[PDB]
Amino acid sequence: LLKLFTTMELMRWSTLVEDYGMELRKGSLESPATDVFGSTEEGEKRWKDLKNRVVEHNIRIMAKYYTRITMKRMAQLLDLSVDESEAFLSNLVVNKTIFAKVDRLAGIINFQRPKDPNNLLNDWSQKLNSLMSLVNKTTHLIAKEEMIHNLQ
Amino acid sequence: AVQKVVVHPLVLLSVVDHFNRIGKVGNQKRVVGVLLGSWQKKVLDVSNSFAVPFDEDDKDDSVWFLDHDYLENMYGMFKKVNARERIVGWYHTGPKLHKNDIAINELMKRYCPNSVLVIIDVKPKDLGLPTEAYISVEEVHDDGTPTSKTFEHVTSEIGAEEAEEVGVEHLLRDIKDTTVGTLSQRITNQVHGLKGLNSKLLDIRSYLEKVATGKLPINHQIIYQLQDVFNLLPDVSLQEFVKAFYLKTNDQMVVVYLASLIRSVVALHNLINNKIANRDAEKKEG
Amino acid sequence: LLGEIPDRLQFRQPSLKRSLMPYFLLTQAVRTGNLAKFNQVLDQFGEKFQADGTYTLIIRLRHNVIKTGVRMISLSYSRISLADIAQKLQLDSPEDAEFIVAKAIRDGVIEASINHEKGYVQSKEMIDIYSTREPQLAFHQRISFCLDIHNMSVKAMRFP
Amino acid sequence: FLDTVSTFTSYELMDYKTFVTYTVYVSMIALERPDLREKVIKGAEILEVLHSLPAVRQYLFSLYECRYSVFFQSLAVVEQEMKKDWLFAPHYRYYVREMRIHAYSQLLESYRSLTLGYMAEAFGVGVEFIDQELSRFIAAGRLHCKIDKVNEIVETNRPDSKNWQYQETIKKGDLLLNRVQKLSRVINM
Amino acid sequence: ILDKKFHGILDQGEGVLIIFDEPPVDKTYEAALETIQNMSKVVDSLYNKAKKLT
């Protein structure tokens, strides 16, 4: 349960079914699998809702790593057809949880970033941030220069 | 505990004027005194201090004495005039530290939980913002030595105060301030390459010396670690700017555009108005 | 002779009008690529040109107008076929059109590629001139022009 | 002409309905599309007189409807009044293609890539007519655009928001600063 | 796009509608339009110029 929530990455959804398919036979207490998987009409909704947990948690980490992705690569990553991806692309984007630009002609799609007008942050994080580590060299270098030259 | 210290030119002079005190009578060692710190927060500040007669024998390299009758009653003096001022540690002019300096701090820890020592310099030479600061902790060691007491460098910075710049900043009178925006930033650039790349060569020659001799320091590992943080861009042949190439000139995009746009209308303000007022006086006079 | 000119009556004066009438319709036939209209201007208005001594250009201005006519079409279209521009500019033949476009590339006038089978000419939009390139590089001559006038104003100010 | 009915009808104002025709024919060029529909719809006294004429009111709303099939018909009806009316003889020549570019402005702004066969639909049917027509618009500086020939593609463009829009500074500023260069050498002498 | 209610552009061949709000106008009209006014500064000063000289 918590393993999918922390650090994410990827796992075959059937392997999660292998673990959560034994909870029907597990027990002792079958009541957790009763209210959930015991009811047919309530389970099928929560089964597809369980899909919404595993497929969107990929979209959450993938939105951080894009950049870009091909449409065919998303199918093997989400472990379903490209059409089910388009359905998961439509229902997640109307919730506006992740901004996405989807081009179906060439298959190249991506999650964010908004068109890259950015100018300041490109130059500022370059000059300010990175060079601060570059100008801090001699600061702590003479600190360690005292360390090595006092003993040796 | 103590992260950074603030050393005023007034208290630093209290070490320098005592260099005239015992400098004329000599003989060996240096100027040493007890430091009065002002601690309002984790950042340390120093306002005043009192210099005490001190000597360190050579032979006998481990021998040192403060005068503690000078330390006790004179504290009640400065405490009576200034309640906030208290002793945070000691100081000396160095220039370097002999091994005996381990025992000076541990003795006065009865006065302050952690006594910060300040190495100062009476004759400014190199390489930059002067003096120095150390803090007394125990890191032991990785090799398994008995518990090792070694002073860790504390970054020192000069700071100002109200009413103290009256006589101090008056006597110079020869400085040009600044001028911010034209010469101020560019002189730094010529020095940023000088002072930036000289320590680059001084250390890279000592880092090559490691393999040769002087090993340890291994270091380890701090040397290459932050050097690899410097390695986000090397920048080596050639500049690896293929992504930053169009962005290079694109940062100069508007800077050149405005410089082209401002100088056009600034001229229209300078050229027109000059011609107007000139011919009004020039030709109407004769 | 530049190839780019507007109608010159914007420079006309009521006193200069009567004198420029034979020279007026001339440039009006330069904006068009018709030979029958251009040759009729030379026949009737050639008498006024005798006093100016400008006959040197009339032989090379025919080659100038055909560059203006093709520039009008090449700037108005992405692709321009040699057979469609043949009679539209009335070059009348495919072979001399291959000679003109060849010399047009030699003079840097046209960027058009040509696919020779019958043949035809297939061009494409020229771009990448963009922003960061031409304006800021031209501004080097603009400011150097302006900063010299700053000295011209100071020099003129020093005399009084 | 914004005064409209405040002048009412006078011996020197002739027929006010004809004065409505005079102001409506200039209002399809000078009065921009956002303000074109505004003055007629939001304007009270001017709206009743245009609804009385079905020919003018049609062409007004059809201009906002953007259909190009009824333009060449209705614009000729306006041109008939423009031909048979005095003082409009010198001024109808530029009026013709100025209402075309007014309809063609919104046209090419719609799509970045447009096929002229799709324009043949609306024009009914432009094939070689708009070939030389739209070409003679670009050469005169009206609606700069790139229309591909035999490839049946129109390209939009031209991004005037950045580059060419800068050129008004220095170009008008050249003869400006030149005028004060020469006149600077005059002082003194 | 003409009514400004929608900012974007279509694709007729491949059938993909692209929306871009990108192309701002900020620095430019704030420059050239002020220079057009500066044309009235010199022309109106041309009266002062020619009057004092001759």
Distance in Å, alpha carbon of D43 to nearest chain E alpha carbon: 20
| Contact list, D175 vs chain B (CB under 8 Å) | none
Q: Which residues make beta-bridge pairs with D147?
A: C77, D154
| Alpha-carbon distance values, A28 to A20, A25, A38, B136 (Å) | 16, 9, 15, 62
**Strand pairing partners for D69?**
none
Structure token pair of residue C99 = 């000679």
CA distances for B13 relative to B7, B20, B70, B90, angstroms: 10, 11, 20, 15
Rounded-to-integer distance, Cα A143 and Cα A139, Å: 7
User: Does A146 contact B153 at a Cβ distance shorter than 8 Å?
Assistant: yes
Mutation target for B interface from D175, D179, D180, D186: give the one with most B CBs within 10 A. D180
Cα A147–A152–B4 angle (5° rounding)?
10
Interchain pair E20, A115: CB under 8 A: yes
Nearest CA in chain E to D154: E12
- Chains B–C, number of C-beta pairs less than 8 Å apart: 42
How many interface pairs between A and B have CB atoms less than 8 angstroms apart?
A: 54
Is residue A8 within 8 A of residue A58, CB to CB? The reply is yes
Contacts of A151 (CB under 8 A, 6+ apart): B217
Give the whole-angstrom CA distance, residue B152 versus residue B97.
12
Question: CA torsion sign, D139 to D141 to D143 to D148?
Answer: positive
Residue type, A101: K
Whether B219 contacts A144, CB under 8 Å: yes
CA distance B63 to chain A (A): 19
Residues pairing with B32 in the sheet:
B92
CB contact under 8 A, D112 and E9: yes
Beta bridge partners of residue B45, listed in sequence order: B6, B38
Helices A82-94 and A71-78, axial angle in degrees (round to 10): 90
Chain D nearest-CA residue for C70: D139
Q: How many CB atoms lie within 10 A of CB B252?
A: 13
In terms of phi and psi (left: phi > 0; alpha: psi -120 to 50; beta: otherwise), the region of B181 is left
Q: Assess contact for D65 and D118: CB atoms under 8 A.
A: no
The per-residue b/e assignment along B10-26, b for 16 or more CB within 10 angstroms, e otherwise, is ebbebbbebbeebeeee
Positions of E strands within D108-152: 113-114, 146-148
Q: Resolution limit in angstroms?
A: 5.8
Query: B238 — phi, psi (to 5°)?
Result: -115, 105
Residue D155 C-alpha, separation from nearest chain B C-alpha, in angstroms: 26
- Do C130 and B249 meet the contact criterion of CB atoms below 8 Å apart? no
Name residue A100's beta-bridge partners.
Answer: A111
Give kind and range of the element (H or E) at residue B255. Answer: helix B245-285
Structure determination method: cryo-EM
Q: Does A141 touch chain B (CB under 8 A)?
A: yes
Q: Among D169, D184, D187, select the one facing B283 at the smallest CB separation.
A: D187
The CB density around residue C120, as the number of other CB atoms within 10 Å, is 16
Listed in sequence order, the residues at least 6 apart from C11 whose beta carbon sits closer than 8 Å to its beta carbon are none
Asked if C75 and D138 touch (Cβ cutoff 8 Å), the reply is yes
Residue of D nearest to E7 (CA): D110
Q: Which residue has the tokens 């109608």?
A: C7
Cβ contact, residue pair B251, A142, below 8 Å: no
C142 vs B197: CA distance, rounded Å: 38
Q: Residue B90 phi/psi, 5° resolution?
A: -135, -175
Among candidates D57, D58, D54, D56, which has minimal Cα distance to D67? D58
Helix (H/G/I), strand (E/B), else coil: D157: coil
Which amino acid type is present at position D54?
A: P
Q: Which residues of A5-29 are buried (b: 16+ CB within 10 A; e: fewer)?
A: eeeeeeeeeeebeeebeeeeeeeee
Cα–Cα distance between B134 and D102 in angstroms, integer?
79
Size of interface B-E (CB pairs under 8 A): 20
Using a CB-CB cut-off of 8 Å, the residues of chain D touching C81 are 149-150
Q: Let me know if C70 is exposed, middle or buried by CB neighbors in 10 A (0-12, 13-18, 19+).
A: buried
Pull the structure tokens for residue B122.
């009476």
Q: What share of chain B is helix, strand, coil (3-state, %, to 5)?
A: 45, 15, 35
Name every residue in B having a CB less than 8 A away from some CB of C. 246, 249-250, 252-253, 256-257, 259-260, 263-264, 267, 270-271, 274-275, 278, 281-282
CA distance E54 to E51: 6
E-chain residues near A104 (CB < 8 A): 16
CA distance D162 to E27: 9
Residue-wise DSSP of B15-53:
HHHHHHHHHHH--SS--EEEEEEEESSSSEEEEEEEE--
CB B131 within 8 A of CB B7: yes
Question: Within an 8 Å CB–CB cutoff, is residue A48 touching chain E?
Answer: no
The DSSP symbol for C115 reads B
Q: How far apart are CA B144 and CA B121, in angstroms?
A: 35
Which chain E residue's Cα is nearest to A116?
A: E22
B62 φ, ψ (degrees, to nearest 5): -95, 5
Contact B70, B33 (CB under 8 A): no
Q: Can you read off the two tokens belonging to residue D188? A: 């003194």
Q: How far is E30 from D165, CA to CA, in rounded Å?
A: 11
Let me know: does D29 contact D99? Beta carbons within 8 Å: yes
Q: How far is D158 from chain B (nearest CA, A)?
A: 21
